[PDB]
Design a binder for this molecule. Structure first.
Ligand SMILES: CC(=O)[C@](C)(O)C(=O)O
Ligand SMILES: [Cl-]
Ligand SMILES: [Cl-]
Length: 314
């Protein structure tokens, strides 16, 4: 066995995502008697911050293991766009119906065939839109807004349909762009908004539209996986499962509850948080429906249809 294994993370331990990675690494070390020793590489440094080619680096073996967002791997694995379909998932029960059901199983099978062994699910969360200029209640309010997105083309199309001017860039590159005003806004889970203190870089309006949510996946490179004994593979897998459950709890703190206290915490920092009426929500869904239909065909219409059904029956 290697003396040190490398785990890639976009977000470090200040964030639930990175805490999940840390827990995984600590449990693996503990339960292998110190035999498997994993170092965390936050900021996606193993790919020079270019998170949208992290999957290829994992498949190639530049990265040994990772906790990744489905968004970042979507350019290489089209099925991961399922979680990015605008207004697919109404709530946490809907996301869980996917990850814990046939849809998640189908996605895992696809990943395994691609040379990247999936072991567990975590969560980034529902990605709420923020900006420095004005309240967003309806699609028209986004007209001309310079919103940062990750470099996965579906996000460009979604925001184009809403009349915005989206620009793609890595999480690293988003920071100076928000600080200078080069972009007006961004979209990310509450726990990321909070831990990155995005209100300090102009993000003073938030709308909790819940348009998409990105889960996380715990994965190991196939050859690293096979290099381990079947018994060690079992330890690492169970450690990922344990870490994933803990990490989802961290990612949902103050959020999967009626009065979303976590967003009230942000109000206290001078953030105007807007909650849409059901009618306002339906207008956003209708405005993005053509993008949804287009990408449903691209992803695999049968897989998306299975997701729709799992959500309806949740
Ligand atoms: C998808 C992801 O990696 C982040 C940190 O949420 C982002 O880049 O916005
Ligand atoms: Cl950090
Ligand atoms: Cl829920």
């Amino acid at each position: 066995y290697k003396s040190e294994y490398k785990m890639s993370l976009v977000l470090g331990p200040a964030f639930p995502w990175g805490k999940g990675g840390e827990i995984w690494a600590d449990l693996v070390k503990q339960r292998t008697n110190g035999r498997i020793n994993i170092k965390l590489y936050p900021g996606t440094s193993l790919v020079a911050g270019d998170q949208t080619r992290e999957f290829s680096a994992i498949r190639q073996g530049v990265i040994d293991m990772a906790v990744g967002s489905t968004i970042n791997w979507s350019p290489q694995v089209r099925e991961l766009n399922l979680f990015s379909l605008p207004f697919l998932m109404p709530d946490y029960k809907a996301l869980d119906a996917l990850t814990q059901g046939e849809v998640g199983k189908s996605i895992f099978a696809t990943l395994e065939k691609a040379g990247v062994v999936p072991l567990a699910w975590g969560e980034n969360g529902f990605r709420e839109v923020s900006n420095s200029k004005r309240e967003i209640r309806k699609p028209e309010d986004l007209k001309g807004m310079k919103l940062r997105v990750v470099g996965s083309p579906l996000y460009i199309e979604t925001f184009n349909a809403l009349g915005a001017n989206p620009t793609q860039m890595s999480w690293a590159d988003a920071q100076p762009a928000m600080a200078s005003g080069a972009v007006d806004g961004q979209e990310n889970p509450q726990s990321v908004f909070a831990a990155a203190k995005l209100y300090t870089v102009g993000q003073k309006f938030v709308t909790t539209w819940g348009y998409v949510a990105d889960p996380l996946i715990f994965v190991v490179n196939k050859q690293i996986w096979e290099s381990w004994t079947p018994a060690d593979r079992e330890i690492v897998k169970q450690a990922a499962v344990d870490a994933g459950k803990q990490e989802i709890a961290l990612a949902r703190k103050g959020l999967a509850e009626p009065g979303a206290p976590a967003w009230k915490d942000m109000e206290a920092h001078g953030v105007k948080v807007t909650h849409l009426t059901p009618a306002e929500h339906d207008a956003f869904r209708k405005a993005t429906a053509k993008v949804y239909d287009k990408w449903k065909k691209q992803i695999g219409t049968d897989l998306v249809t299975k997701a729709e059904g799992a959500i309806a029956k949740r």
